[PDB]
Every structure is written in C-alpha cells, then in structure tokens.
Short mmCIF file of C-alpha atoms in Angstrom, two decimals:
data_model
loop_
_atom_site.label_atom_id
_atom_site.label_comp_id
_atom_site.label_asym_id
_atom_site.label_seq_id
_atom_site.Cartn_x
_atom_site.Cartn_y
_atom_site.Cartn_z
CA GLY A 1 -4.58 23.75 56.28
CA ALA A 2 -2.38 24.84 53.38
CA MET A 3 -1.98 21.53 51.54
CA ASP A 4 0.04 21.20 48.34
CA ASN A 5 -2.62 18.96 46.83
CA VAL A 6 0.33 17.47 44.88
CA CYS A 7 2.85 19.93 43.46
CA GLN A 8 1.33 21.77 40.50
CA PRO A 9 2.43 24.03 37.62
CA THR A 10 2.39 27.79 38.13
CA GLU A 11 -0.72 28.20 35.96
CA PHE A 12 -4.24 27.25 37.03
CA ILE A 13 -7.72 27.12 35.52
CA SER A 14 -10.89 28.14 37.34
CA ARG A 15 -14.57 28.40 36.45
CA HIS A 16 -16.19 31.44 37.99
CA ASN A 17 -19.38 33.42 38.14
CA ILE A 18 -19.30 36.63 36.13
CA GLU A 19 -19.05 38.76 39.30
CA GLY A 20 -15.77 37.02 39.99
CA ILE A 21 -17.14 34.26 42.22
CA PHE A 22 -15.03 31.11 41.98
CA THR A 23 -17.29 28.13 41.44
CA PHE A 24 -14.64 25.51 40.63
CA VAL A 25 -10.86 25.75 40.99
CA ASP A 26 -8.14 23.34 39.87
CA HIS A 27 -5.51 22.31 42.44
CA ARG A 28 -2.84 24.31 40.53
CA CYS A 29 -4.11 27.27 42.62
CA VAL A 30 -1.80 26.21 45.46
CA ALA A 31 1.31 26.29 43.35
CA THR A 32 0.52 29.54 41.58
CA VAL A 33 -0.86 31.52 44.55
CA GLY A 34 -0.81 29.30 47.64
CA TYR A 35 -4.60 29.25 47.72
CA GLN A 36 -6.54 26.03 47.87
CA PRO A 37 -9.47 25.37 45.52
CA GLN A 38 -11.76 25.71 48.49
CA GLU A 39 -10.23 29.08 49.41
CA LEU A 40 -11.47 30.67 46.21
CA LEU A 41 -14.89 28.99 46.10
CA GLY A 42 -17.39 31.68 47.01
CA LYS A 43 -14.95 34.56 46.78
CA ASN A 44 -14.49 37.24 44.16
CA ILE A 45 -11.13 37.24 42.37
CA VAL A 46 -11.40 40.99 43.01
CA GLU A 47 -11.05 40.32 46.74
CA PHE A 48 -7.60 38.86 46.20
CA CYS A 49 -6.82 41.37 43.47
CA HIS A 50 -4.21 44.11 44.06
CA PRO A 51 -6.24 47.17 45.27
CA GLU A 52 -4.82 49.30 42.43
CA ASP A 53 -5.75 46.74 39.77
CA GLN A 54 -9.14 45.64 41.09
CA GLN A 55 -10.90 47.98 38.71
CA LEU A 56 -8.54 46.89 35.95
CA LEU A 57 -9.85 43.35 36.34
CA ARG A 58 -13.43 44.61 36.43
CA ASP A 59 -13.08 46.68 33.23
CA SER A 60 -11.42 43.82 31.36
CA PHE A 61 -13.85 41.21 32.61
CA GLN A 62 -16.64 43.42 31.34
CA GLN A 63 -14.88 43.49 27.97
CA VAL A 64 -14.58 39.71 27.68
CA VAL A 65 -18.34 39.67 28.22
CA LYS A 66 -18.41 42.30 25.44
CA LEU A 67 -16.17 40.29 23.10
CA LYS A 68 -17.70 36.92 23.96
CA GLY A 69 -15.54 33.99 22.89
CA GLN A 70 -12.39 36.01 22.46
CA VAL A 71 -9.50 35.43 24.82
CA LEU A 72 -8.82 38.67 26.68
CA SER A 73 -5.61 39.02 28.62
CA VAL A 74 -5.58 41.15 31.76
CA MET A 75 -2.54 41.58 33.88
CA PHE A 76 -2.78 42.26 37.59
CA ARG A 77 -1.26 41.32 40.96
CA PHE A 78 -2.85 38.26 42.53
CA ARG A 79 -2.66 37.89 46.26
CA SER A 80 -0.92 34.57 46.96
CA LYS A 81 -1.46 32.69 50.27
CA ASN A 82 1.46 34.73 51.54
CA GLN A 83 -0.64 37.84 51.10
CA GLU A 84 1.82 38.97 48.48
CA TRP A 85 0.91 40.71 45.23
CA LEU A 86 2.61 38.79 42.41
CA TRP A 87 2.22 39.45 38.67
CA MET A 88 -0.37 37.23 37.07
CA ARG A 89 -2.02 37.47 33.68
CA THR A 90 -5.53 36.16 33.42
CA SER A 91 -6.74 35.13 29.97
CA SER A 92 -10.48 35.73 29.94
CA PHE A 93 -12.92 33.42 28.21
CA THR A 94 -16.69 33.41 28.34
CA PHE A 95 -18.19 29.94 27.97
CA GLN A 96 -21.16 30.44 25.66
CA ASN A 97 -23.73 27.93 24.60
CA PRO A 98 -24.35 28.57 20.86
CA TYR A 99 -28.03 27.74 21.22
CA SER A 100 -29.19 30.59 23.39
CA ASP A 101 -25.93 32.54 23.09
CA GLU A 102 -25.84 32.49 26.87
CA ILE A 103 -22.84 32.30 29.19
CA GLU A 104 -22.76 29.77 31.98
CA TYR A 105 -19.52 30.99 33.49
CA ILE A 106 -16.20 32.72 32.84
CA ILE A 107 -12.99 30.73 32.58
CA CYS A 108 -9.97 32.12 34.41
CA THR A 109 -6.80 30.99 32.77
CA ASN A 110 -4.24 32.28 35.23
CA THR A 111 -0.66 32.46 34.24
CA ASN A 112 1.77 33.81 36.82
CA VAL A 113 4.59 35.78 35.32
CA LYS A 114 6.73 37.89 37.59
CA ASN A 115 6.90 38.07 41.34
CA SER A 116 7.43 41.04 43.67
CA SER A 117 7.58 39.56 47.18
CA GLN A 118 9.24 36.15 47.33
CA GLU A 119 12.83 37.32 47.81
#
C-alpha cells in the first residue's frame, strides 16, 4: 500500500467519534503522517499517540467536549507511517447541532509542527 493519494499539505482534517475513532479522513493524512485515510478509519487517535501524551490527548479532548464549540489546541506526538513520533498540534472542535445541542462528531484539525525522527 502506502499511496501518496496526490501530494498533500502537512495539515489534515478528520471527523472522528468522541472516543478517538476516525470516521472520515482527508487524504492529507499521508503527507502529514504517512497514514492513509483508511488506516485511521476505525482506530483511536490515541493508538497512534505518543505513549507519554496519550492521556494528554484524552484530557484535552474531554475539555473540548466541556467547552463545546471552542477550538482547543492540544500538542502531542503523532505516530507517522514511519512509526516516528513527530510534533503535531490538534485543534479540537465539537460539531454541535444547535437544535438538540448534540455533538455528531469531533473535528481533528491536525497541524504538524516539529519533527523528531526524519533526520
């Protein structure tokens, strides 16, 4: 596998279930972290989260569900397709329907900053 899916920017957007389960991923996943859209679908972002920051994601994801509608930035190391732990900041957004005040999914805006593996 490991297709480029057309060279993408180093930031990607994904819709995911509140437990971290990727439901829909944009092709920019490959450029940012090597992963294909399919690779994330059904997985928790916490599975590919740096083992020392996995709780950091959890705590902050809980807080975006606390804030509701506010963009909450959490910075962690995402495991690229090279099984490396690069520095990515996820901006958390909870998609609410202002009729029942319910959330359908969380939106992972993933902006990769530094790297700590690729040379």
